[PDB]
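pasting input
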Amino acid sequence: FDLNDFLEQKVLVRMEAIINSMTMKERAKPEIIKGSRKRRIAAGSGMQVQDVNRLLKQFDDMQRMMKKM
RNA sequence: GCUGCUGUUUACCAGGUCAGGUCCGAAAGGAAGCAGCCAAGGCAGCGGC
């Protein structure tokens, strides 16, 4: 379960925007996304790092909700 | 080395285009620009000089 699957699942348009600005490797192995890449992603989707963190955070609770079934 | 071809590889860090999204604007319209792609570079094989 990666950020691509999470993508298949108003504010939702801006969530796609963020993911739509990452590279394939990033969508597949989310943990490689540190500070520098977050900056690229945020500006790339006209967002704020915090928005990105908020998304990665959600995908996290989401991913964690998967590693339990 | 230079050059042609082929395979492969490369998040951002003054290449082109730019889905999505963003910014400015009452609007008409403008601006920047990630991913992708093209290009370019890296690692090599073969050929030409």
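fyi The domain at 1-68 of chain A is CATH 1.10.260.30 (434 Repressor (Amino-terminal Domain)).
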